[PDB]
Amino acid sequence: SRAYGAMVSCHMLSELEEVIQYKLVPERREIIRQIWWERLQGCQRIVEDWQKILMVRSLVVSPHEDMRTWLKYASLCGKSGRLALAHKTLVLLLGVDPSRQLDHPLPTVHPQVTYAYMKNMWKSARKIDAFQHMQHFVQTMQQQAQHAIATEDQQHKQELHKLMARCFLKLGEWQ
Numbered sequence: 001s002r003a004y005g006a007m008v009s010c011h012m013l014s015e016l017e018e019v020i021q022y023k024l025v026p027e028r029r030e031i032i033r034q035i036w037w038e039r040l041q042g043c044q045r046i047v048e049d050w051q052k053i054l055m056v057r058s059l060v061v062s063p064h065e066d067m068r069t070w071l072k073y074a075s076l077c078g079k080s081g082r083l084a085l086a087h088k089t090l091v092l093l094l095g096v097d098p099s100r101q102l103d104h105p106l107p108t109v110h111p112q113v114t115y116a117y118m119k120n121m122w123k124s125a126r127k128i129d130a131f132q133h134m135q136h137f138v139q140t141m142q143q144q145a146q147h148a149i150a151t152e153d154q155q156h157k158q159e160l161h162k163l164m165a166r167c168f169l170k171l172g173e174w175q
């Protein structure tokens, strides 16, 4: 346990070497990203270590290019009593600020990021407006899925169905 800090330092150095590999090799990008995700999953859930590792990885990976890792990090921050940083990460991922545009509905792009932001807002005691946004988002998702049902998109349709089931469960719990 006393050596864990040095272990994190070694992890960061290895990530740096893998970053130079990511820069050099254009066909290794997906493999490198999967390795980073799995190795980060292996590590402890301390916010500071995750922040250091993500800063290291940011040299070649913008947050938009990998929304899953930053969503996990934001969830960890939210569960660690740092809702300010979690909201900052969510608004960075979305690209627009729902806080300033209260009247404007939440964006539909990146539905996973939207759902994460909505649950963070629910944790932010803004329950009624969060529920209103959730109703609007469910209506948008169902109508968009109905319009965009096609044989080409099935895995996307399955993920959309999973997210919609989660949204329905959250709607029931919050009601």
Ligand SMILES: O=P(O)(O)O[C@H]1[C@H](OP(=O)(O)O)[C@@H](OP(=O)(O)O)[C@H](OP(=O)(O)O)[C@@H](OP(=O)(O)O)[C@H]1OP(=O)(O)O
Pocket: 071, 072, 075, 076, 116, 119, 166, 169
């Ligand atoms: O913290 P909660 O509100 O209960 O949400 C949990 C939590 O989601 P976050 O990634 O946003 O934290 C779980 O993540 P863990 O921190 O436990 O790893 C996730 O589980 P997975 O990591 O397996 O995706 C699970 O998702 P699901 O219910 O689809 O299994 C999801 O639950 P809700 O989406 O229903 O809130």
